């Protein structure tokens, strides 16, 4: 179907947020003393969530720079 | 673009301008000429004695010609903008 840039950014932000929610739940369960979850899993997932968030930060910063360069144009 | 087409658009623009102005210039020249004819035969004058007749004439013209003038200008401009895409090439 169509593109709908806004929808794409919405989906990307939902992906980042629920990845972090999964990492947070993993940390919750590990610190709460449940079977299954291992410390390597917790650390790896938390690092993955951090990397995804950092990538989001960079994409946002470049979009804002592009926006404030496009609308500082003199018509 | 070719100069043939730009001259075409230019003459169309000139003829819409002339039609737009025709009543005003026409009545201005007519009343000026009438007061200039009557300027002699009692050659008394200060400078013109025709300004107010010209103003009332253009008043009358803008009232009576009026709507068709504005309609012609609007139709010209609307057609120009409508066929603007098709004149690039």
């Amino acid at each position: 179907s169509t593109v709908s840039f806004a929808g794409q950014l919405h989906a990307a932000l939902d992906r980042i947020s629920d990845r972090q929610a999964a990492a947070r739940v993993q940390a919750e369960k590990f610190t709460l003393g449940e079977p299954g979850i291992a410390l390597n899993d917790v650390m790896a997932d938390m690092q993955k969530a951090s990397v995804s968030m950092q990538m989001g930060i960079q994409v946002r910063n470049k979009l804002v720079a592009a926006y404030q360069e496009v609308m500082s144009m003199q018509v | 673009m070719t100069p043939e087409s730009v001259m075409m658009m230019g003459t169309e623009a000139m003829k819409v301008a002339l039609a737009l102005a025709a009543p005003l210039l026409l009545v201005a020249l007519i009343t000026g000429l009438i007061i200039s004819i009557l300027q002699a035969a009692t050659q008394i004058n200060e400078m013109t004695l025709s300004f107010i007749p010209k103003i009332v004439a253009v008043f009358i013209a803008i009232i009576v010609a009026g709507p068709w003038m504005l309609n012609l200008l609007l139709d010209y401009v609307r057609t120009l903008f409508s066929n603007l895409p098709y004149i690039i090439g």
């Binding site: - | 087409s5 001259m7 090439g89």
Partner: protein, 250 residues
């Protein structure tokens, strides 16, 4: 800036009329052009077209030679006009330009040529009118494409070509022996690329009747049969079929 183009076009039409009427079997030619507007910013353009209607000298028709003459003249006259689009009309319809069925005519004239040659050979023997042949020739009209990549087999090291070669040998004396060997070859290659013809013969079928003098002698029959076999270009691999029979006419 527009009507000038119309003036130019219709003046050209008059010019081409003035040309065509000076072609012999022509008295008048009314012509129409079809010029798409040349855009310089969109790419996908359209080719033009030409429609000529000619009034011939009464009782004169144009063979394909003069049809080609007029079509070529008109096509090359108009800027960038392929001779396909030139549609010609005889003063009573009758499209001299065929621009799905021409293959039937193509087979017909192929058979006509072969049959004519058979008659030309067999007439001097048995008479101008003592022989009939008809040809039924199967034709191929599929577009055949092909690409072969023949390689030569370098299995035999006597005739292989090595670019690089590493060979490690060891043996201890309880014997331990090792022999590693790596080889990079260069390979002979042939690449044919045939775009086979549209409209070749794929088989012939020819039947011939020869008139009586009384039946002709068996040797005289076999020599006529061999002659017509020669004239067919008879190829057995093509499965060409030929029959020659003798029996009196009506």
């Amino acid at each position: 800036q527009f009507s000038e183009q119309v003036n130019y076009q219709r003046a050209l039409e008059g010019e081409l009329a003035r040309t065509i009427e000076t072609l012999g079997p022509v008295k008048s030619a009314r012509v129409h052009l079809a010029m798409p507007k040349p855009s310089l910013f969109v790419r996908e353009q359209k080719s033009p077209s030409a429609s000529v209607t000619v009034t011939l000298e009464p009782g004169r028709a144009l063979d394909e030679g003069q049809i080609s003459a007029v079509v070529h003249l008109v096509s090359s006259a108009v800027a960038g006009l392929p001779p396909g689009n030139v549609t010609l009309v005889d003063q009573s319809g009758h499209l001299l330009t065929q621009s799905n069925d021409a293959q039937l005519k193509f087979a017909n004239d192929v058979e006509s040529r072969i049959q004519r040659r058979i008659e030309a050979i067999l007439s001097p023997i048995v008479g101008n009118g003592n022989v009939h042949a008809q040809v039924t020739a199967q034709l191929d009209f599929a577009n055949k494409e092909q690409t072969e990549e023949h390689y030569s087999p370098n299995g035999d090291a006597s005739k292989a070509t090595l670019r690089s070669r590493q060979l490690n040998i060891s043996e201890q004396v309880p014997r331990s022996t090792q022999r590693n060997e790596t080889s990079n070859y260069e390979v002979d290659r042939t690449i044919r690329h045939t775009k086979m013809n549209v409209g070749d013969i794929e088989r012939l079928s020819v039947a011939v009747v020869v008139n009586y003098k009384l039946p002709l002698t068996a040797d005289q029959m076999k020599q006529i049969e061999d002659l017509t076999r020669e004239a067919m270009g008879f190829s057995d691999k093509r499965g060409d079929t030929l029959n020659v029979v003798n029996s009196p006419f009506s």
